Design a binder for this molecule. Sequence first.
Ligand SMILES: *[C@@H]1O[C@H](CO)[C@@H](O[C@@H]2O[C@H](CO)[C@@H](O[C@H]3O[C@H](CO)[C@@H](O)[C@H](O)[C@@H]3O)[C@H](O)[C@H]2NC(C)=O)[C@H](O)[C@H]1NC(C)=O
Ligand SMILES: *[C@@H]1O[C@H](CO)[C@@H](O)[C@H](O)[C@H]1NC(C)=O
Lengths: 49, 49
Amino acid sequence: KNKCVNFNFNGLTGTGVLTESNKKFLPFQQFGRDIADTTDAVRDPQTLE
Amino acid sequence: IANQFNSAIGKIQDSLSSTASALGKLQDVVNQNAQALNTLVKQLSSNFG
Ligand SMILES: *[C@@H]1O[C@H](CO)[C@@H](O[C@@H]2O[C@H](CO)[C@@H](O[C@H]3O[C@H](CO)[C@@H](O)[C@H](O)[C@@H]3O)[C@H](O)[C@H]2NC(C)=O)[C@H](O)[C@H]1NC(C)=O
Ligand SMILES: *[C@@H]1O[C@H](CO)[C@@H](O)[C@H](O)[C@H]1NC(C)=O
């Protein structure tokens, strides 16, 4: 977290800095998206955060 | 002439404090800037086939 990183989650490859979010996802949602249709929040598959 | 001028400047304070419609010539420039940028971000969603 807080470093720039080549992330992949579930085939969502991208680049960015990860941070602990306060978004209240529901159990069925894996990704949240920007106005630009680009992912900008993700639920890690190892640990549900 | 001074009382007419002082009273007339007094109406500029009240007019600008009151009517929502006044600075429309400036707010429509800020709105055209913002709408063109939101449209340009939104065009990142488009598939183009
Ligand atoms: C030229 O136009 C002037 C208006 O822009 C006008 O001034 C106004 O004169 C009236 C009296 O004639 C004043 O009315 C008030 O008079 C007393 C209080 O002072 C009260 O008895 C009245 O009920 C009323 O409140 C206006 O206040 C006054 N306005 C200004 C800006 O001075 C002139 O009289 C006109 N001059 C000529 C030669 O016609
Ligand atoms: C991943 O492993 C942790 C224990 O290390 C476990 O709590 C978690 O439920 C596992 N995730 C999945 C999706 O099985």
